[PDB]
Amino acid sequence: YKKPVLLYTSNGGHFLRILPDGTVDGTRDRSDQHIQLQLSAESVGEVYIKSTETGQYLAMDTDGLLYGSQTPNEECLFLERLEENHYNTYISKKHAEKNWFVGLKKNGSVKRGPRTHYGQKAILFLVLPVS
């Protein structure tokens, strides 16, 4: 959590991106300004995910859609969970009982919460600290 990180999924080989207009998607461009993220932990295993460039927070709405919020609240808290020792997954804490994950489709668009589950490539992120 000390360094900014990139979150990479092998589903379509995308980095999680929070665009300045509040749109969330994926890009293969590792030099994109808006894929530089900062994780911060409330409690152990509970994180905010923030754009280092814009300060916006990752959030998930009641339809399971990801978007960027200028400031955080309970809709921005995610449960960070280890899978297969090397990947992290992120579950909406607000919708933890719906098992709604942060995920990206192969085409780089957001995979909505309702369509996600453990073990999907879409939700498996490699956390890459920035040098």
Curated annotation (Swiss-Prot):
A motif (Nuclear localization signal) lies at residues 2-5. It comes from the Eukaryota. Changing K111A: Loss of LRRC59-binding. Its main location: secreted. Heparin binds at N11. In the nucleus, phosphorylated by PKC/PRKCD. GO terms for molecular function: fibroblast growth factor receptor binding; growth factor activity; heparin binding; integrin binding; S100 protein binding. GO terms for biological process: activation of protein kinase B activity; anatomical structure morphogenesis; angiogenesis; branch elongation involved in ureteric bud branching; cellular response to heat; epithelial cell proliferation; fibroblast growth factor receptor signaling pathway; lung development. Keywords: Acetylation, Angiogenesis, Cytoplasm, Developmental protein, Differentiation, Growth factor, Heparin-binding, Mitogen, Nucleus, Phosphoprotein, Secreted. Residues 105-121 are annotated as: Heparin-binding. Predominantly expressed in kidney and brain. Detected at much lower levels in heart and skeletal muscle. GO terms for cellular component: cell cortex; cytoplasm; cytosol; extracellular matrix; extracellular region; extracellular space; nucleoplasm; nucleus. Belongs to the heparin-binding growth factors family. Monomer. Homodimer. Interacts with FGFR1, FGFR2, FGFR3 and FGFR4. Affinity between fibroblast growth factors (FGFs) and their receptors is increased by heparan sulfate glycosaminoglycans that function as coreceptors. Found in a complex with FGFBP1, FGF1 and FGF2. Interacts with FGFBP1. Part of a Cu(2+)-dependent multiprotein aggregate containing FGF1, S100A13 and SYT1. Interacts with SYT1. Interacts with S100A13. Interacts with LRRC59. Interacts with CSNKA, CSNKB and FIBP. While binding with LRRC59, CSNKA and FIBP seem mutually exclusive, CSNKB and FIBP may cooperatively interact with FGF1. Plays an important role in the regulation of cell survival, cell division, angiogenesis, cell differentiation and cell migration. Functions as a potent mitogen in vitro. Acts as a ligand for FGFR1 and integrins. Binds to FGFR1 in the presence of heparin leading to FGFR1 dimerization and activation via sequential autophosphorylation on tyrosine residues which act as docking sites for interacting proteins, leading to the activation of several signaling cascades. Binds to integrin ITGAV:ITGB3. This is Fibroblast growth factor 1. The chain holds residues 23 to 153 of 155 of the full protein.
